[PDB]
Design a protein around this ligand. Structure first.
Ligand SMILES: [NH3+]CCc1ccccc1
Length: 271
Protein backbone atom coordinates (compact mmCIF):
# COMPACT_ATOMS: atom_id res chain seq x y z
CA UNK A 1 0.00 0.00 0.00
CA UNK A 2 0.93 3.68 0.05
CA UNK A 3 2.99 4.44 -3.05
CA UNK A 4 1.19 1.78 -5.09
CA UNK A 5 -2.21 3.13 -4.08
CA UNK A 6 -1.30 6.67 -5.13
CA UNK A 7 -0.27 5.50 -8.59
CA UNK A 8 -3.69 3.88 -9.00
CA UNK A 9 -5.57 7.06 -8.07
CA UNK A 10 -3.55 9.17 -10.52
CA UNK A 11 -4.12 6.69 -13.36
CA UNK A 12 -7.90 7.11 -12.96
CA UNK A 13 -8.50 10.55 -11.43
CA UNK A 14 -5.95 12.31 -13.62
CA UNK A 15 -7.18 10.35 -16.64
CA UNK A 16 -10.95 10.64 -16.20
CA UNK A 17 -10.60 14.37 -16.87
CA UNK A 18 -9.19 13.82 -20.36
CA UNK A 19 -11.84 11.29 -21.40
CA UNK A 20 -14.73 13.29 -19.92
CA UNK A 21 -13.64 16.70 -21.26
CA UNK A 22 -13.43 15.64 -24.91
CA UNK A 23 -16.76 13.93 -25.55
CA UNK A 24 -18.74 16.59 -23.69
CA UNK A 25 -16.95 19.55 -25.31
CA UNK A 26 -17.56 20.16 -29.01
CA UNK A 27 -14.76 22.75 -29.01
CA UNK A 28 -12.21 19.92 -28.68
CA UNK A 29 -13.61 17.48 -31.26
CA UNK A 30 -10.54 17.79 -33.50
CA UNK A 31 -9.36 14.53 -35.12
CA UNK A 32 -5.98 14.78 -33.37
CA UNK A 33 -7.75 14.97 -30.00
CA UNK A 34 -9.57 11.66 -30.51
CA UNK A 35 -6.25 9.79 -30.39
CA UNK A 36 -5.61 11.35 -26.98
CA UNK A 37 -9.04 10.11 -25.86
CA UNK A 38 -8.21 6.55 -26.91
CA UNK A 39 -4.86 6.74 -25.11
CA UNK A 40 -6.70 7.99 -22.03
CA UNK A 41 -9.12 5.07 -22.23
CA UNK A 42 -6.23 2.59 -22.40
CA UNK A 43 -4.51 4.19 -19.40
CA UNK A 44 -7.80 4.22 -17.46
CA UNK A 45 -8.29 0.52 -18.14
CA UNK A 46 -4.74 -0.12 -16.91
CA UNK A 47 -5.56 1.80 -13.75
CA UNK A 48 -8.84 0.01 -13.04
CA UNK A 49 -8.23 -3.56 -14.19
CA UNK A 50 -4.61 -4.71 -14.15
CA UNK A 51 -3.15 -2.42 -11.50
CA UNK A 52 -5.33 -3.24 -8.44
CA UNK A 53 -4.82 -6.98 -8.97
CA UNK A 54 -1.07 -6.57 -9.45
CA UNK A 55 -0.94 -4.46 -6.27
CA UNK A 56 -1.52 -7.41 -3.93
CA UNK A 57 0.66 -9.60 -6.13
CA UNK A 58 3.63 -7.33 -5.41
CA UNK A 59 3.01 -7.11 -1.64
CA UNK A 60 2.32 -10.79 -0.84
CA UNK A 61 4.78 -12.32 -3.35
CA UNK A 62 2.16 -14.88 -4.38
CA UNK A 63 -0.78 -15.24 -6.76
CA UNK A 64 -3.59 -15.70 -4.25
CA UNK A 65 -6.26 -15.60 -6.96
CA UNK A 66 -5.83 -19.09 -8.34
CA UNK A 67 -4.26 -19.93 -11.69
CA UNK A 68 -6.88 -19.00 -14.26
CA UNK A 69 -6.64 -15.45 -12.99
CA UNK A 70 -2.95 -15.55 -13.84
CA UNK A 71 -3.26 -17.24 -17.23
CA UNK A 72 -5.56 -14.32 -17.91
CA UNK A 73 -4.20 -11.44 -15.87
CA UNK A 74 -0.88 -11.57 -17.74
CA UNK A 75 -2.13 -11.72 -21.32
CA UNK A 76 -4.20 -8.54 -21.29
CA UNK A 77 -1.49 -6.78 -19.29
CA UNK A 78 0.92 -7.50 -22.14
CA UNK A 79 -1.91 -6.65 -24.54
CA UNK A 80 -3.06 -3.17 -23.59
CA UNK A 81 -0.03 -2.18 -21.56
CA UNK A 82 1.71 -2.31 -24.94
CA UNK A 83 -1.25 -0.50 -26.51
CA UNK A 84 -0.20 2.65 -24.66
CA UNK A 85 3.04 2.63 -26.67
CA UNK A 86 1.35 2.53 -30.08
CA UNK A 87 -0.66 5.61 -29.16
CA UNK A 88 2.56 7.49 -28.40
CA UNK A 89 4.06 6.25 -31.65
CA UNK A 90 1.05 7.57 -33.55
CA UNK A 91 0.99 10.91 -31.71
CA UNK A 92 4.59 11.30 -32.85
CA UNK A 93 3.59 10.67 -36.44
CA UNK A 94 0.90 13.27 -35.93
CA UNK A 95 3.37 15.91 -34.82
CA UNK A 96 5.69 14.99 -37.68
CA UNK A 97 2.97 15.41 -40.29
CA UNK A 98 1.89 18.68 -38.67
CA UNK A 99 5.37 20.23 -38.62
CA UNK A 100 7.37 18.68 -41.47
CA UNK A 101 4.48 18.97 -43.97
CA UNK A 102 2.35 21.89 -42.76
CA UNK A 103 0.51 22.61 -46.01
CA UNK A 104 -1.42 19.33 -45.98
CA UNK A 105 -2.07 18.62 -42.30
CA UNK A 106 -5.90 18.73 -42.34
CA UNK A 107 -5.87 16.95 -45.73
CA UNK A 108 -3.99 13.88 -44.49
CA UNK A 109 -5.13 13.84 -40.84
CA UNK A 110 -8.88 13.50 -41.13
CA UNK A 111 -11.03 11.60 -38.66
CA UNK A 112 -10.98 8.62 -41.01
CA UNK A 113 -7.25 8.27 -40.40
CA UNK A 114 -7.31 8.90 -36.65
CA UNK A 115 -9.99 6.19 -36.54
CA UNK A 116 -7.69 3.75 -38.31
CA UNK A 117 -4.90 4.40 -35.80
CA UNK A 118 -7.12 3.54 -32.83
CA UNK A 119 -8.26 0.24 -34.35
CA UNK A 120 -4.66 -0.72 -35.09
CA UNK A 121 -3.47 0.39 -31.65
CA UNK A 122 -6.22 -1.61 -29.94
CA UNK A 123 -6.57 -4.83 -31.95
CA UNK A 124 -3.00 -5.60 -33.02
CA UNK A 125 -1.66 -5.01 -29.50
CA UNK A 126 -4.13 -7.63 -28.26
CA UNK A 127 -4.14 -10.37 -30.91
CA UNK A 128 -0.39 -10.95 -30.50
CA UNK A 129 -0.61 -11.07 -26.70
CA UNK A 130 -3.53 -13.46 -26.43
CA UNK A 131 -1.71 -15.68 -28.95
CA UNK A 132 1.38 -15.86 -26.71
CA UNK A 133 0.07 -16.42 -23.19
CA UNK A 134 -2.67 -18.93 -24.07
CA UNK A 135 -1.37 -20.76 -27.15
CA UNK A 136 1.84 -21.55 -25.28
CA UNK A 137 4.25 -19.91 -27.72
CA UNK A 138 5.49 -17.86 -24.76
CA UNK A 139 7.56 -20.78 -23.42
CA UNK A 140 9.34 -23.26 -25.67
CA UNK A 141 11.13 -24.76 -22.67
CA UNK A 142 8.69 -25.28 -19.80
CA UNK A 143 10.86 -27.42 -17.51
CA UNK A 144 12.80 -24.38 -16.29
CA UNK A 145 9.61 -22.31 -16.22
CA UNK A 146 7.87 -24.56 -13.69
CA UNK A 147 10.58 -24.61 -11.04
CA UNK A 148 11.25 -20.88 -10.90
CA UNK A 149 7.68 -19.63 -11.39
CA UNK A 150 4.96 -22.08 -10.37
CA UNK A 151 6.25 -24.09 -7.41
CA UNK A 152 7.37 -21.03 -5.45
CA UNK A 153 4.17 -19.26 -6.49
CA UNK A 154 3.48 -15.83 -7.94
CA UNK A 155 3.26 -14.85 -11.61
CA UNK A 156 5.93 -12.86 -13.45
CA UNK A 157 5.45 -13.96 -17.06
CA UNK A 158 8.99 -15.16 -17.79
CA UNK A 159 9.81 -15.31 -21.52
CA UNK A 160 12.06 -17.76 -23.32
CA UNK A 161 14.98 -16.69 -25.47
CA UNK A 162 13.32 -17.36 -28.84
CA UNK A 163 10.26 -15.22 -28.05
CA UNK A 164 11.72 -12.62 -25.68
CA UNK A 165 13.38 -10.95 -28.68
CA UNK A 166 9.93 -10.61 -30.25
CA UNK A 167 8.66 -8.99 -27.07
CA UNK A 168 11.50 -6.48 -27.27
CA UNK A 169 10.74 -5.68 -30.92
CA UNK A 170 7.24 -4.50 -29.95
CA UNK A 171 8.90 -1.83 -27.81
CA UNK A 172 11.78 -0.97 -30.17
CA UNK A 173 9.46 0.03 -33.02
CA UNK A 174 7.21 2.17 -30.76
CA UNK A 175 10.47 3.79 -29.60
CA UNK A 176 12.49 4.08 -32.83
CA UNK A 177 9.66 6.05 -34.43
CA UNK A 178 9.34 8.38 -31.44
CA UNK A 179 13.00 9.45 -31.39
CA UNK A 180 13.55 9.62 -35.15
CA UNK A 181 10.44 11.79 -35.55
CA UNK A 182 11.61 13.97 -32.65
CA UNK A 183 15.21 14.29 -33.81
CA UNK A 184 14.04 15.83 -37.08
CA UNK A 185 11.57 18.13 -35.33
CA UNK A 186 14.22 19.39 -32.94
CA UNK A 187 16.32 20.52 -35.88
CA UNK A 188 13.40 22.00 -37.81
CA UNK A 189 12.28 23.92 -34.73
CA UNK A 190 15.89 25.09 -34.33
CA UNK A 191 16.37 26.52 -37.83
CA UNK A 192 13.05 28.38 -37.51
CA UNK A 193 13.92 30.13 -34.25
CA UNK A 194 17.18 31.37 -35.79
CA UNK A 195 15.25 32.48 -38.88
CA UNK A 196 13.14 34.87 -36.82
CA UNK A 197 16.17 36.74 -35.46
CA UNK A 198 15.15 26.76 -29.66
CA UNK A 199 15.01 27.29 -25.90
CA UNK A 200 11.41 26.07 -25.72
CA UNK A 201 11.60 23.31 -28.35
CA UNK A 202 14.39 21.54 -26.46
CA UNK A 203 12.49 21.66 -23.16
CA UNK A 204 9.20 20.41 -24.64
CA UNK A 205 10.77 17.64 -26.71
CA UNK A 206 13.02 16.70 -23.80
CA UNK A 207 10.12 15.98 -21.45
CA UNK A 208 8.10 14.12 -24.10
CA UNK A 209 11.11 11.84 -24.75
CA UNK A 210 12.68 11.51 -21.29
CA UNK A 211 9.39 10.50 -19.66
CA UNK A 212 8.99 7.62 -22.10
CA UNK A 213 12.62 6.50 -22.06
CA UNK A 214 13.08 6.70 -18.28
CA UNK A 215 10.18 4.29 -17.71
CA UNK A 216 9.62 1.82 -20.56
CA UNK A 217 13.26 1.39 -21.60
CA UNK A 218 14.84 0.31 -18.26
CA UNK A 219 12.28 -2.43 -17.67
CA UNK A 220 12.30 -3.89 -21.18
CA UNK A 221 16.11 -3.81 -21.34
CA UNK A 222 16.37 -5.95 -18.21
CA UNK A 223 13.49 -8.11 -19.46
CA UNK A 224 15.11 -8.95 -22.82
CA UNK A 225 18.52 -10.09 -21.53
CA UNK A 226 17.14 -12.33 -18.76
CA UNK A 227 16.57 -15.13 -21.27
CA UNK A 228 20.29 -15.30 -22.14
CA UNK A 229 22.28 -14.70 -18.93
CA UNK A 230 20.26 -17.24 -16.92
CA UNK A 231 17.88 -15.52 -14.43
CA UNK A 232 20.32 -13.91 -12.00
CA UNK A 233 18.00 -10.93 -11.59
CA UNK A 234 16.25 -11.23 -8.22
CA UNK A 235 12.48 -11.48 -8.18
CA UNK A 236 12.25 -8.70 -5.59
CA UNK A 237 14.06 -6.21 -7.86
CA UNK A 238 11.44 -6.90 -10.54
CA UNK A 239 8.41 -5.34 -8.81
CA UNK A 240 9.86 -1.85 -9.26
CA UNK A 241 10.58 -2.68 -12.90
CA UNK A 242 7.00 -3.74 -13.62
CA UNK A 243 5.70 -0.72 -11.68
CA UNK A 244 7.79 1.74 -13.72
CA UNK A 245 5.62 1.21 -16.81
CA UNK A 246 2.60 1.67 -14.57
CA UNK A 247 4.07 4.96 -13.44
CA UNK A 248 4.57 5.95 -17.06
CA UNK A 249 0.91 5.25 -17.83
CA UNK A 250 -0.07 7.49 -14.91
CA UNK A 251 1.91 10.53 -16.14
CA UNK A 252 0.82 10.17 -19.78
CA UNK A 253 -2.36 12.28 -19.52
CA UNK A 254 -0.08 14.90 -17.92
CA UNK A 255 2.64 15.26 -20.55
CA UNK A 256 -0.04 15.23 -23.25
CA UNK A 257 -3.27 17.27 -23.06
CA UNK A 258 -2.15 18.94 -19.83
CA UNK A 259 1.10 20.68 -20.80
CA UNK A 260 -0.68 22.55 -23.57
CA UNK A 261 -2.64 25.76 -22.94
CA UNK A 262 -5.41 25.07 -25.45
CA UNK A 263 -6.69 22.28 -23.18
CA UNK A 264 -6.41 24.11 -19.85
CA UNK A 265 -8.16 27.12 -21.38
CA UNK A 266 -11.06 24.99 -22.61
CA UNK A 267 -11.32 23.13 -19.28
CA UNK A 268 -11.13 26.29 -17.14
CA UNK A 269 -14.60 27.30 -18.40
CA UNK A 270 -16.27 24.94 -15.92
CA UNK A 271 -17.48 27.82 -13.74
N1 LIG B 1 3.84 -4.11 -17.35
C1 LIG B 1 4.23 -5.24 -18.17
C2 LIG B 1 3.60 -5.10 -19.55
C3 LIG B 1 4.40 -5.92 -20.57
C4 LIG B 1 5.19 -6.97 -20.15
C5 LIG B 1 5.91 -7.70 -21.07
C6 LIG B 1 5.83 -7.40 -22.42
C7 LIG B 1 5.03 -6.35 -22.84
C8 LIG B 1 4.32 -5.61 -21.91
Amino acid sequence: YGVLGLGALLAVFGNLLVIIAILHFKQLHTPTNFLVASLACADFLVGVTVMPFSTVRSVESCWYFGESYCKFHTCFDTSFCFASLFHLCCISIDRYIAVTDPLTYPTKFTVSVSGLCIALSWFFSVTYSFSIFYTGANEEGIEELVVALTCVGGCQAPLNQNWVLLCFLLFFLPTVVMVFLYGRIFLVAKYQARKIEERKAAKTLGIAMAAFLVSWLPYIIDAVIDAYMNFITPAYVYEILVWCVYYNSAMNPLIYAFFYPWFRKAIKLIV
